[PDB]
Short mmCIF file of C-alpha atoms and ligand atoms in Angstrom, two decimals:
data_model
loop_
_atom_site.label_atom_id
_atom_site.label_comp_id
_atom_site.label_asym_id
_atom_site.label_seq_id
_atom_site.Cartn_x
_atom_site.Cartn_y
_atom_site.Cartn_z
CA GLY A 1 13.41 -88.70 9.93
CA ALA A 2 14.74 -85.28 8.90
CA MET A 3 14.78 -84.37 12.61
CA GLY A 4 16.99 -87.30 13.52
CA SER A 5 20.15 -85.20 13.68
CA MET A 6 18.66 -82.48 15.93
CA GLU A 7 18.91 -82.56 19.72
CA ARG A 8 15.66 -83.33 21.61
CA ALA A 9 16.03 -80.10 23.61
CA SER A 10 16.58 -78.11 20.39
CA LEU A 11 13.41 -79.63 18.88
CA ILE A 12 11.42 -78.55 21.95
CA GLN A 13 12.95 -75.10 21.86
CA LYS A 14 12.09 -74.72 18.19
CA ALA A 15 8.54 -76.03 18.68
CA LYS A 16 8.06 -73.18 21.17
CA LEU A 17 9.45 -70.66 18.68
CA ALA A 18 7.24 -72.03 15.93
CA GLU A 19 4.22 -71.65 18.23
CA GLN A 20 5.17 -67.97 18.84
CA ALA A 21 5.43 -67.47 15.08
CA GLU A 22 2.14 -69.36 14.43
CA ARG A 23 4.10 -71.85 12.24
CA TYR A 24 2.05 -74.90 13.33
CA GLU A 25 3.21 -77.24 10.54
CA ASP A 26 6.80 -76.61 11.67
CA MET A 27 5.75 -76.93 15.33
CA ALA A 28 4.20 -80.31 14.57
CA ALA A 29 7.27 -81.53 12.70
CA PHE A 30 9.54 -80.52 15.55
CA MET A 31 7.31 -82.27 18.09
CA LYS A 32 7.13 -85.43 15.92
CA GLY A 33 10.96 -85.40 15.95
CA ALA A 34 10.95 -84.98 19.73
CA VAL A 35 8.59 -87.92 20.20
CA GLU A 36 10.70 -90.10 17.92
CA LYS A 37 13.69 -89.62 20.23
CA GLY A 38 11.94 -92.28 22.27
CA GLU A 39 11.80 -90.62 25.69
CA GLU A 40 8.47 -90.01 27.48
CA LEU A 41 7.05 -86.45 27.24
CA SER A 42 6.56 -84.11 30.15
CA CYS A 43 3.22 -82.33 30.66
CA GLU A 44 4.50 -79.20 28.93
CA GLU A 45 5.85 -81.31 26.03
CA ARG A 46 2.53 -83.25 25.67
CA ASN A 47 0.80 -79.87 25.38
CA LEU A 48 3.19 -78.74 22.65
CA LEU A 49 2.45 -81.90 20.71
CA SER A 50 -1.31 -81.53 21.06
CA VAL A 51 -1.40 -77.79 20.26
CA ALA A 52 0.69 -78.30 17.11
CA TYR A 53 -1.38 -81.09 15.54
CA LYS A 54 -4.69 -79.55 16.73
CA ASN A 55 -3.89 -76.40 14.74
CA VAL A 56 -2.71 -78.29 11.70
CA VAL A 57 -5.68 -80.66 11.52
CA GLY A 58 -8.03 -77.87 12.54
CA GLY A 59 -7.09 -75.96 9.42
CA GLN A 60 -7.42 -79.05 7.24
CA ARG A 61 -10.92 -79.77 8.70
CA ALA A 62 -12.04 -76.19 8.02
CA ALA A 63 -10.86 -76.43 4.43
CA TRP A 64 -12.40 -79.89 3.94
CA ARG A 65 -15.78 -78.52 5.12
CA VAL A 66 -15.60 -75.60 2.64
CA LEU A 67 -14.79 -77.98 -0.17
CA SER A 68 -17.37 -80.63 0.83
CA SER A 69 -20.08 -77.91 0.93
CA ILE A 70 -19.17 -76.77 -2.60
CA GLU A 71 -19.20 -80.41 -3.73
CA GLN A 72 -22.61 -80.96 -2.15
CA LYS A 73 -24.08 -77.97 -3.97
CA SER A 74 -22.60 -79.28 -7.25
CA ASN A 75 -24.67 -82.42 -6.85
CA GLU A 76 -28.01 -80.63 -6.35
CA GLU A 77 -30.67 -80.62 -9.12
CA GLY A 78 -30.10 -77.84 -11.65
CA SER A 79 -26.42 -77.41 -10.79
CA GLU A 80 -24.32 -77.06 -13.92
CA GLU A 81 -21.75 -79.89 -14.45
CA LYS A 82 -18.28 -78.51 -13.77
CA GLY A 83 -16.21 -81.69 -14.16
CA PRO A 84 -14.14 -83.66 -11.63
CA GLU A 85 -12.17 -80.75 -10.19
CA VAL A 86 -14.19 -80.10 -6.97
CA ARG A 87 -14.17 -83.83 -6.05
CA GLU A 88 -10.48 -84.14 -6.92
CA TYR A 89 -9.48 -81.13 -4.77
CA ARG A 90 -11.71 -82.21 -1.82
CA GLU A 91 -10.01 -85.64 -2.15
CA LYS A 92 -6.58 -84.02 -2.07
CA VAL A 93 -7.31 -82.09 1.10
CA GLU A 94 -9.03 -85.18 2.59
CA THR A 95 -6.00 -87.39 1.90
CA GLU A 96 -3.64 -84.84 3.51
CA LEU A 97 -5.93 -84.68 6.53
CA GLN A 98 -6.04 -88.47 6.85
CA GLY A 99 -2.27 -88.44 6.60
CA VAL A 100 -1.92 -86.06 9.53
CA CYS A 101 -4.35 -88.18 11.58
CA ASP A 102 -2.44 -91.34 10.75
CA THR A 103 0.85 -89.65 11.76
CA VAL A 104 -0.56 -88.66 15.16
CA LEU A 105 -2.10 -92.11 15.69
CA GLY A 106 1.23 -93.59 14.74
CA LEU A 107 3.07 -91.60 17.39
CA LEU A 108 0.54 -92.61 20.01
CA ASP A 109 0.92 -96.28 19.01
CA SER A 110 4.72 -96.13 18.72
CA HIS A 111 5.09 -95.78 21.59
CA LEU A 112 3.51 -92.98 23.63
CA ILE A 113 0.49 -94.80 25.01
CA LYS A 114 2.20 -98.04 26.00
CA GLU A 115 4.87 -96.16 27.99
CA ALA A 116 2.33 -93.85 29.74
CA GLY A 117 1.61 -95.21 33.22
CA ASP A 118 0.51 -92.19 35.13
CA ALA A 119 -3.17 -91.41 34.77
CA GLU A 120 -2.62 -87.86 33.56
CA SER A 121 -0.38 -88.95 30.69
CA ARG A 122 -2.36 -92.07 29.73
CA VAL A 123 -5.69 -90.20 29.72
CA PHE A 124 -4.14 -87.31 27.71
CA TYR A 125 -2.89 -89.73 25.00
CA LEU A 126 -6.03 -91.79 24.89
CA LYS A 127 -8.12 -88.63 24.48
CA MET A 128 -5.87 -87.74 21.52
CA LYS A 129 -6.38 -91.21 20.08
CA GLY A 130 -10.16 -90.72 20.31
CA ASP A 131 -9.93 -87.23 18.81
CA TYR A 132 -7.84 -88.26 15.74
CA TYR A 133 -10.10 -91.29 15.04
CA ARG A 134 -13.04 -88.80 15.36
CA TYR A 135 -11.40 -86.59 12.66
CA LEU A 136 -10.98 -89.68 10.50
CA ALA A 137 -14.65 -90.45 11.11
CA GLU A 138 -15.73 -87.01 9.99
CA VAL A 139 -14.48 -87.73 6.42
CA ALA A 140 -15.20 -91.49 6.34
CA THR A 141 -17.84 -92.64 3.87
CA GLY A 142 -16.86 -96.23 3.18
CA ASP A 143 -16.70 -99.84 4.47
CA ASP A 144 -14.49 -98.93 7.45
CA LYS A 145 -16.57 -95.98 8.73
CA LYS A 146 -18.10 -98.19 11.44
CA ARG A 147 -14.72 -99.55 12.58
CA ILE A 148 -13.24 -95.98 12.57
CA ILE A 149 -16.13 -94.80 14.76
CA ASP A 150 -15.68 -97.74 17.09
CA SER A 151 -11.96 -97.02 17.32
CA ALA A 152 -12.75 -93.48 18.49
CA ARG A 153 -15.38 -94.74 20.97
CA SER A 154 -13.02 -97.39 22.42
CA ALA A 155 -10.20 -94.91 23.00
CA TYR A 156 -12.53 -92.32 24.60
CA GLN A 157 -14.09 -95.01 26.78
CA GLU A 158 -10.76 -96.28 28.12
CA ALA A 159 -9.78 -92.64 28.85
CA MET A 160 -13.10 -92.05 30.60
CA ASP A 161 -12.77 -95.16 32.74
CA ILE A 162 -9.27 -94.20 33.91
CA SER A 163 -10.18 -90.55 34.42
CA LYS A 164 -13.20 -91.43 36.62
CA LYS A 165 -11.11 -93.71 38.79
CA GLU A 166 -7.96 -91.65 39.07
CA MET A 167 -8.69 -87.93 38.66
CA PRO A 168 -10.95 -85.43 40.43
CA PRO A 169 -14.10 -84.31 38.59
CA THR A 170 -12.54 -80.85 38.12
CA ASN A 171 -9.37 -82.09 36.48
CA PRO A 172 -9.06 -80.16 33.16
CA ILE A 173 -7.97 -83.26 31.21
CA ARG A 174 -10.97 -85.17 32.57
CA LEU A 175 -13.19 -82.20 31.68
CA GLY A 176 -11.82 -81.78 28.18
CA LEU A 177 -12.07 -85.52 27.53
CA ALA A 178 -15.72 -85.47 28.55
CA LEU A 179 -16.41 -82.38 26.45
CA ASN A 180 -14.96 -84.10 23.36
CA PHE A 181 -16.57 -87.52 23.97
CA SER A 182 -19.87 -85.69 24.36
CA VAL A 183 -19.27 -84.08 20.93
CA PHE A 184 -18.34 -87.55 19.54
CA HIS A 185 -21.75 -88.76 20.73
CA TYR A 186 -23.64 -85.79 19.23
CA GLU A 187 -21.81 -85.42 15.95
CA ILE A 188 -20.41 -88.88 15.08
CA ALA A 189 -22.39 -91.57 16.94
CA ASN A 190 -25.86 -90.09 16.33
CA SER A 191 -26.47 -90.20 20.09
CA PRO A 192 -27.55 -86.66 21.09
CA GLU A 193 -29.17 -87.83 24.33
CA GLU A 194 -25.94 -89.48 25.42
CA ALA A 195 -24.03 -86.27 24.46
CA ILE A 196 -26.35 -84.11 26.56
CA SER A 197 -26.37 -86.48 29.55
CA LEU A 198 -22.59 -86.63 29.53
CA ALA A 199 -22.11 -82.88 29.31
CA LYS A 200 -24.66 -82.23 32.08
CA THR A 201 -23.34 -84.85 34.52
CA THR A 202 -19.74 -83.75 33.90
CA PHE A 203 -20.65 -80.09 34.51
CA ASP A 204 -22.62 -80.83 37.69
CA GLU A 205 -19.95 -83.10 39.20
CA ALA A 206 -17.29 -80.48 38.48
CA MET A 207 -19.46 -77.71 40.04
CA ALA A 208 -19.66 -79.72 43.26
CA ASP A 209 -15.86 -80.03 43.57
CA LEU A 210 -14.93 -76.39 42.75
CA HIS A 211 -14.78 -75.61 46.52
CA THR A 212 -11.60 -77.73 46.87
CA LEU A 213 -9.62 -75.66 44.35
CA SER A 214 -7.16 -72.84 44.42
CA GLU A 215 -7.98 -69.68 42.47
CA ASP A 216 -5.71 -70.81 39.62
CA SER A 217 -7.15 -74.35 39.39
CA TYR A 218 -10.65 -72.83 39.60
CA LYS A 219 -9.93 -70.68 36.53
CA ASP A 220 -8.81 -73.69 34.46
CA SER A 221 -11.75 -75.85 35.44
CA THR A 222 -14.42 -73.19 35.06
CA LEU A 223 -13.16 -72.34 31.59
CA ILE A 224 -13.87 -75.87 30.37
CA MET A 225 -17.10 -76.05 32.34
CA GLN A 226 -18.26 -73.04 30.33
CA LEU A 227 -17.57 -74.96 27.10
CA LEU A 228 -19.78 -77.81 28.37
CA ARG A 229 -22.50 -75.23 29.13
CA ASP A 230 -22.04 -73.68 25.68
CA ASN A 231 -22.62 -77.06 24.03
CA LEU A 232 -25.64 -77.77 26.22
CA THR A 233 -27.06 -74.39 25.21
CA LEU A 234 -26.47 -75.22 21.56
CA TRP A 235 -28.18 -78.61 21.93
CA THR A 236 -31.23 -77.69 24.00
CA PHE B 1 -20.00 -76.45 15.37
CA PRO B 2 -19.74 -77.48 19.04
CA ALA B 3 -16.77 -76.75 21.26
CA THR B 4 -13.86 -79.21 21.70
CA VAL B 5 -10.44 -78.81 23.26
CA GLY C 1 6.37 -79.80 -12.54
CA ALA C 2 3.82 -81.83 -10.58
CA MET C 3 1.11 -79.74 -12.28
CA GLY C 4 2.30 -80.64 -15.75
CA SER C 5 -0.40 -83.27 -16.27
CA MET C 6 -3.31 -81.04 -15.19
CA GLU C 7 -5.33 -78.95 -17.62
CA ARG C 8 -4.77 -75.15 -17.48
CA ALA C 9 -8.51 -74.60 -16.92
CA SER C 10 -8.54 -77.18 -14.11
CA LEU C 11 -5.58 -75.41 -12.42
CA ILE C 12 -7.48 -72.11 -12.54
CA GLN C 13 -10.64 -73.75 -11.23
CA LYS C 14 -8.71 -75.30 -8.37
CA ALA C 15 -6.88 -72.06 -7.55
CA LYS C 16 -10.32 -70.50 -7.05
CA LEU C 17 -11.41 -73.36 -4.80
CA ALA C 18 -8.20 -73.12 -2.82
CA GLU C 19 -8.83 -69.39 -2.35
CA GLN C 20 -12.35 -70.17 -1.00
CA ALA C 21 -10.83 -72.69 1.39
CA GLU C 22 -8.00 -70.28 2.41
CA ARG C 23 -5.44 -72.86 1.16
CA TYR C 24 -3.01 -70.26 -0.22
CA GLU C 25 0.00 -72.60 -0.58
CA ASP C 26 -2.17 -74.83 -2.79
CA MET C 27 -3.56 -71.76 -4.61
CA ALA C 28 -0.01 -70.63 -5.36
CA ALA C 29 1.04 -74.05 -6.61
CA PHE C 30 -1.96 -74.25 -8.91
CA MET C 31 -1.26 -70.77 -10.30
CA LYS C 32 2.46 -71.59 -10.79
CA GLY C 33 1.27 -74.60 -12.84
CA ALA C 34 -1.06 -72.38 -14.83
CA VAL C 35 1.71 -69.89 -15.63
CA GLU C 36 4.03 -72.71 -16.70
CA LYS C 37 1.53 -73.73 -19.38
CA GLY C 38 3.08 -70.84 -21.27
CA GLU C 39 -0.03 -68.85 -22.22
CA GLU C 40 -0.49 -65.21 -21.15
CA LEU C 41 -2.76 -64.62 -18.11
CA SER C 42 -6.02 -62.73 -18.17
CA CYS C 43 -6.71 -59.96 -15.63
CA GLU C 44 -8.66 -62.37 -13.39
CA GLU C 45 -5.82 -64.94 -13.65
CA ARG C 46 -3.12 -62.32 -12.83
CA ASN C 47 -5.12 -61.49 -9.71
CA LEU C 48 -5.28 -65.14 -8.68
CA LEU C 49 -1.51 -65.39 -9.03
CA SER C 50 -0.89 -62.24 -7.01
CA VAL C 51 -3.39 -63.05 -4.25
CA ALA C 52 -1.92 -66.54 -3.79
CA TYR C 53 1.73 -65.54 -3.42
CA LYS C 54 0.87 -62.37 -1.43
CA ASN C 55 -0.81 -64.54 1.21
CA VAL C 56 1.97 -67.10 1.26
CA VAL C 57 4.81 -64.60 1.54
CA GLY C 58 2.76 -62.42 3.84
CA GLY C 59 2.63 -65.25 6.34
CA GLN C 60 6.34 -65.96 5.97
CA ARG C 61 7.17 -62.24 6.54
CA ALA C 62 5.03 -62.16 9.69
CA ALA C 63 6.79 -65.22 11.06
CA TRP C 64 10.23 -63.91 10.09
CA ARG C 65 9.53 -60.67 12.00
CA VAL C 66 8.48 -62.63 15.14
CA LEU C 67 11.64 -64.69 14.95
CA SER C 68 13.96 -61.76 14.15
CA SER C 69 12.56 -59.86 17.18
CA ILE C 70 13.27 -62.82 19.47
CA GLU C 71 16.76 -63.08 17.96
CA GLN C 72 17.37 -59.37 18.51
CA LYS C 73 16.40 -59.62 22.18
CA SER C 74 18.75 -62.62 22.55
CA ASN C 75 21.65 -60.40 21.54
CA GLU C 76 20.95 -57.64 24.10
CA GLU C 77 23.21 -57.21 27.17
CA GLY C 78 22.18 -59.47 30.04
CA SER C 79 20.29 -61.93 27.83
CA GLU C 80 21.06 -65.51 28.78
CA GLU C 81 22.84 -67.55 26.02
CA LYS C 82 20.35 -70.04 24.60
CA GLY C 83 22.46 -71.57 21.82
CA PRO C 84 22.05 -71.49 18.02
CA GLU C 85 18.39 -72.49 17.86
CA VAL C 86 16.76 -69.03 17.41
CA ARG C 87 19.22 -68.08 14.61
CA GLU C 88 18.83 -71.50 12.98
CA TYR C 89 15.00 -71.32 12.96
CA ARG C 90 14.94 -67.68 11.75
CA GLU C 91 17.34 -68.84 8.99
CA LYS C 92 15.00 -71.69 8.08
CA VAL C 93 12.00 -69.41 7.74
CA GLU C 94 14.16 -66.82 5.91
CA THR C 95 15.38 -69.39 3.38
CA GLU C 96 11.80 -70.58 2.69
CA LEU C 97 10.74 -66.97 2.22
CA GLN C 98 13.60 -66.27 -0.19
CA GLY C 99 12.60 -69.40 -2.04
CA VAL C 100 9.04 -68.19 -2.54
CA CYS C 101 10.36 -64.81 -3.74
CA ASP C 102 12.73 -66.48 -6.16
CA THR C 103 9.88 -68.66 -7.50
CA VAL C 104 7.71 -65.60 -8.18
CA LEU C 105 10.59 -63.69 -9.76
CA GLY C 106 11.29 -66.74 -11.85
CA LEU C 107 7.75 -66.82 -13.22
CA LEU C 108 7.90 -63.13 -14.03
CA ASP C 109 11.24 -63.63 -15.84
CA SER C 110 10.15 -66.84 -17.60
CA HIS C 111 8.24 -65.45 -19.30
CA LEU C 112 5.39 -63.27 -17.99
CA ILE C 113 6.99 -59.85 -18.30
CA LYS C 114 8.52 -60.26 -21.74
CA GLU C 115 5.19 -61.38 -23.22
CA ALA C 116 3.17 -58.57 -21.52
CA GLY C 117 2.60 -55.76 -24.02
CA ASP C 118 -0.48 -54.07 -22.76
CA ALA C 119 0.18 -51.46 -20.11
CA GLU C 120 -2.15 -53.01 -17.56
CA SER C 121 -0.43 -56.38 -17.69
CA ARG C 122 3.16 -55.05 -17.94
CA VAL C 123 2.66 -52.62 -15.04
CA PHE C 124 0.99 -55.37 -12.93
CA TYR C 125 3.98 -57.72 -13.45
CA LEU C 126 6.60 -55.08 -12.94
CA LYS C 127 4.94 -54.02 -9.68
CA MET C 128 5.15 -57.68 -8.57
CA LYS C 129 8.81 -57.77 -9.54
CA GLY C 130 9.43 -54.68 -7.36
CA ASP C 131 7.39 -56.14 -4.49
CA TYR C 132 9.22 -59.53 -4.40
CA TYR C 133 12.67 -57.83 -4.59
CA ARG C 134 11.39 -55.59 -1.73
CA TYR C 135 10.60 -58.74 0.33
CA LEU C 136 14.08 -60.03 -0.46
CA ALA C 137 15.45 -56.68 0.67
CA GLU C 138 13.63 -56.87 3.98
CA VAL C 139 15.75 -59.92 5.01
CA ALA C 140 18.97 -59.00 3.19
CA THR C 141 21.99 -58.27 5.38
CA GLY C 142 24.92 -59.08 3.10
CA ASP C 143 27.04 -58.02 0.07
CA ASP C 144 24.08 -58.08 -2.32
CA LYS C 145 21.67 -55.99 -0.21
CA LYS C 146 22.42 -52.92 -2.33
CA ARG C 147 21.88 -54.76 -5.63
CA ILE C 148 18.63 -56.32 -4.27
CA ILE C 149 17.39 -52.84 -3.32
CA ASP C 150 18.34 -51.47 -6.72
CA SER C 151 16.54 -54.37 -8.40
CA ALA C 152 13.34 -53.42 -6.56
CA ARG C 153 13.80 -49.72 -7.39
CA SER C 154 14.43 -50.42 -11.09
CA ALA C 155 11.32 -52.58 -11.46
CA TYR C 156 9.10 -50.05 -9.61
CA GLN C 157 10.54 -47.21 -11.69
CA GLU C 158 9.83 -48.90 -15.03
CA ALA C 159 6.27 -49.65 -13.80
CA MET C 160 5.85 -46.02 -12.72
CA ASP C 161 7.08 -44.66 -16.03
CA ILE C 162 4.65 -46.83 -18.03
CA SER C 163 1.75 -46.20 -15.65
CA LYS C 164 2.18 -42.40 -15.88
CA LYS C 165 2.21 -42.50 -19.65
CA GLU C 166 -0.50 -45.05 -20.26
CA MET C 167 -3.02 -45.13 -17.40
CA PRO C 168 -5.27 -42.54 -15.74
CA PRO C 169 -4.24 -41.27 -12.29
CA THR C 170 -7.20 -43.16 -10.76
CA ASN C 171 -6.27 -46.53 -12.22
CA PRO C 172 -6.13 -48.98 -9.26
CA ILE C 173 -2.95 -50.67 -10.53
CA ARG C 174 -1.28 -47.27 -10.89
CA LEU C 175 -2.50 -46.38 -7.39
CA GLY C 176 -1.36 -49.61 -5.79
CA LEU C 177 2.02 -49.40 -7.52
CA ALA C 178 2.51 -45.89 -6.15
CA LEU C 179 1.39 -46.95 -2.67
CA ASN C 180 3.97 -49.77 -2.64
CA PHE C 181 6.83 -47.76 -4.19
CA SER C 182 6.15 -45.10 -1.57
CA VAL C 183 6.53 -47.81 1.13
CA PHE C 184 9.74 -48.99 -0.63
CA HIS C 185 11.08 -45.46 -0.24
CA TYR C 186 10.08 -45.18 3.44
CA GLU C 187 11.01 -48.65 4.64
CA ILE C 188 13.80 -49.89 2.33
CA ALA C 189 15.52 -46.92 0.66
CA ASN C 190 15.70 -44.70 3.77
CA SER C 191 13.96 -41.94 1.78
CA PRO C 192 10.94 -40.88 3.90
CA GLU C 193 10.62 -37.52 2.13
CA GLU C 194 10.38 -39.25 -1.23
CA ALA C 195 7.79 -41.68 0.25
CA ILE C 196 5.65 -38.82 1.54
CA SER C 197 5.94 -36.75 -1.66
CA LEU C 198 4.95 -39.74 -3.77
CA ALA C 199 1.95 -40.67 -1.63
CA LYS C 200 0.72 -37.05 -1.53
CA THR C 201 1.09 -36.34 -5.25
CA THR C 202 -0.51 -39.68 -6.15
CA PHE C 203 -3.47 -39.00 -3.83
CA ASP C 204 -4.00 -35.45 -5.11
CA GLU C 205 -3.80 -36.40 -8.80
CA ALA C 206 -6.27 -39.23 -8.22
CA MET C 207 -8.66 -36.87 -6.33
CA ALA C 208 -8.73 -34.57 -9.34
CA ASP C 209 -9.77 -37.36 -11.75
CA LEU C 210 -12.49 -38.98 -9.57
CA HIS C 211 -15.16 -36.91 -11.43
CA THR C 212 -14.61 -39.00 -14.60
CA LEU C 213 -15.49 -42.30 -12.92
CA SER C 214 -18.50 -44.51 -12.57
CA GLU C 215 -19.71 -45.37 -9.08
CA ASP C 216 -17.97 -48.76 -9.27
CA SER C 217 -14.61 -47.38 -10.48
CA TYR C 218 -14.90 -44.64 -7.84
CA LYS C 219 -15.17 -47.29 -5.10
CA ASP C 220 -12.02 -49.10 -6.27
CA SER C 221 -9.96 -45.95 -6.59
CA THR C 222 -11.08 -44.34 -3.34
CA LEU C 223 -10.27 -47.52 -1.44
CA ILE C 224 -6.61 -47.30 -2.46
CA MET C 225 -6.56 -43.55 -2.00
CA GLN C 226 -7.53 -44.17 1.62
CA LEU C 227 -4.49 -46.44 2.02
CA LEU C 228 -2.26 -43.61 0.72
CA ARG C 229 -3.89 -41.28 3.28
CA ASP C 230 -3.42 -43.90 6.02
CA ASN C 231 0.31 -44.05 5.28
CA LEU C 232 0.60 -40.27 5.17
CA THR C 233 -1.11 -40.13 8.55
CA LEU C 234 1.31 -42.69 9.91
CA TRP C 235 4.30 -40.75 8.57
CA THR C 236 3.37 -37.18 9.51
CA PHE D 1 3.67 -51.40 9.40
CA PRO D 2 2.46 -49.28 6.46
CA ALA D 3 -0.19 -50.39 3.99
CA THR D 4 0.67 -52.15 0.70
CA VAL D 5 -1.50 -53.98 -1.82
C1 O4I E 301 -0.01 -81.83 30.84
C2 O4I E 301 -1.42 -81.31 31.13
O1 O4I E 301 -1.86 -81.28 32.35
N1 O4I E 301 -2.10 -80.83 30.09
C3 O4I E 301 -3.47 -80.31 30.17
C4 O4I E 301 -3.71 -78.81 30.28
C5 O4I E 301 -5.15 -78.53 30.70
C6 O4I E 301 -5.59 -77.06 30.55
N2 O4I E 301 -5.22 -76.53 29.23
C7 O4I E 301 -5.99 -75.69 28.46
O2 O4I E 301 -5.50 -74.99 27.55
C8 O4I E 301 -7.52 -75.62 28.56
C9 O4I E 301 -8.16 -75.22 27.22
C10 O4I E 301 -8.00 -74.70 29.68
O3 O4I E 301 -8.08 -76.94 28.79
C11 O4I E 301 -7.68 -78.08 28.13
C12 O4I E 301 -6.80 -78.12 27.05
C13 O4I E 301 -6.45 -79.34 26.52
C14 O4I E 301 -6.98 -80.48 27.06
CL1 O4I E 301 -6.57 -82.00 26.40
C15 O4I E 301 -7.87 -80.47 28.11
C16 O4I E 301 -8.23 -79.25 28.65
C17 O4I E 301 -3.76 -76.63 29.03
C18 O4I E 301 -3.37 -78.08 28.98
C1 O4I E 302 -6.25 -57.36 -13.72
C2 O4I E 302 -6.40 -56.12 -12.82
O1 O4I E 302 -6.94 -55.05 -13.28
N1 O4I E 302 -6.02 -56.26 -11.55
C3 O4I E 302 -6.07 -55.17 -10.55
C4 O4I E 302 -7.25 -55.10 -9.58
C5 O4I E 302 -7.26 -53.73 -8.90
C6 O4I E 302 -8.21 -53.63 -7.69
N2 O4I E 302 -8.04 -54.77 -6.78
C7 O4I E 302 -8.06 -54.72 -5.40
O2 O4I E 302 -8.29 -55.73 -4.71
C8 O4I E 302 -7.72 -53.45 -4.62
C9 O4I E 302 -7.14 -53.79 -3.24
C10 O4I E 302 -8.91 -52.51 -4.47
O3 O4I E 302 -6.64 -52.72 -5.24
C11 O4I E 302 -5.50 -53.31 -5.74
C12 O4I E 302 -5.15 -54.66 -5.60
C13 O4I E 302 -4.00 -55.12 -6.20
C14 O4I E 302 -3.24 -54.25 -6.92
CL1 O4I E 302 -1.79 -54.81 -7.67
C15 O4I E 302 -3.54 -52.91 -7.06
C16 O4I E 302 -4.69 -52.45 -6.47
C17 O4I E 302 -8.29 -56.04 -7.50
C18 O4I E 302 -7.22 -56.22 -8.56
MG1 MG E 303 21.00 -86.05 22.50
MG1 MG E 304 -11.04 -90.22 0.10
MG1 MG E 305 -23.13 -92.40 32.61
MG1 MG E 306 -4.68 -78.55 -22.49
MG1 MG E 307 20.08 -66.17 5.44
MG1 MG E 308 8.04 -36.84 -8.78
#
């Protein structure tokens, strides 16, 4: 690893600088180096890791969708043949995206998840595992598409089970997990009723526990609750 | 596209 | 070159796709490959080249400025010592930026400029040469800073001389060249009076020739004239 | 920052 000679603390410091500079590829590389030092990550450090890769893959997904749309139009009746270039370039972007997903899944498997014993860390990592299999699913068209989808489902489900047992219904990790698993149901698993049920129940159970929270915790929870409501509005 | 975090 | 096996036309096609996807690094790599085929570039192709690298270097410059600002604050009285990390990371971004500039200058020198005989192409390339030496100047702090600045000036001046002889005062390349050379004067050469004079004279001479233009040409020229006015407003 | 094109 090119980051093998840099101090863990220096990698974290630089990830924070990269974030400030909106250099997310760099931020992700620094955080990969930090993980590979082999020590568990703090809450702040887990967030740096997730922010970095979310931004990187988020950009790849946006580009893939542009390119896939162009490709789709090229295959409509009456579209002039333009050769292999659109497919080739969509494939290039797709392969880079899959590579990023595999890198993140690799970090979670070696060895973030197995060393995470506290609910907050284990749920955080398992949510990521679900999310990155979901991104793989978005581009999957082959023999393994089912197994990729099931991999996402299984990770989300383990996260859900732990989060329900161990965290309050207003916990922002629990909320964000539910938000994303709900989207998995709607967009990946062809289960819109499940998506809607999940978002509604999650919202309502959080609403009921808001009274227990400080002003600051209330802000964090209500922000994610609004995202659940936004999805429900979109879907109904 | 729906919201995720 | 990794693009050596791809058709010129395919490189151009993919640069256009990359633009649509906002994949400017890819766009720049494709256009570098296209240039290295050795044929002159059309107007459309010159624009693809310039858009791609402008976006790439524009992002690097924004990041460099964030990082330089942080570094500056670190060297104020009463700032806590945080070690070499801010300088190292600013250096990293700086070196990548210089690399991009050197790549563009390399393409212009081998052999875009020497093969460009028409005024519109030669002025376009010489403006780029000025611009990329200007970006080098922005980060230069050493023994060669003067020579880098003079390199920018010399390229801009040759472009100006040709553009005044060979193009109308409303020509958008002539206008954009003047806009940028004016900024060179203000920001790099410590010559704000020269910057202001240039922007004013360029604006006024363009105004006087607007009557000769079609509606479409009028739109293009007036857009850049507004940028000259915006700078003048900023500077006065 | 001033405008350039
Ligand atoms: C270590 C830890 O507790 N991390 C989670 C927090 C939760 C709140 N965060 C947020 O930015 C918002 C968007 C409000 O909610 C999230 C973000 C990310 C996730 Cl996985 C869930 C909820 C900061 C990180
Ligand atoms: C081949 C050629 O004629 N290229 C130049 C044109 C001029 C107009 N363009 C523009 O986008 C605006 C911003 C209006 O003006 C420019 C852009 C770039 C330059 Cl170098 C000068 C003026 C499209 C490219
Ligand atoms: Mg150490
Ligand atoms: Mg593929
Ligand atoms: Mg249920
Ligand atoms: Mg050929
Ligand atoms: Mg340096
Ligand atoms: Mg003069």
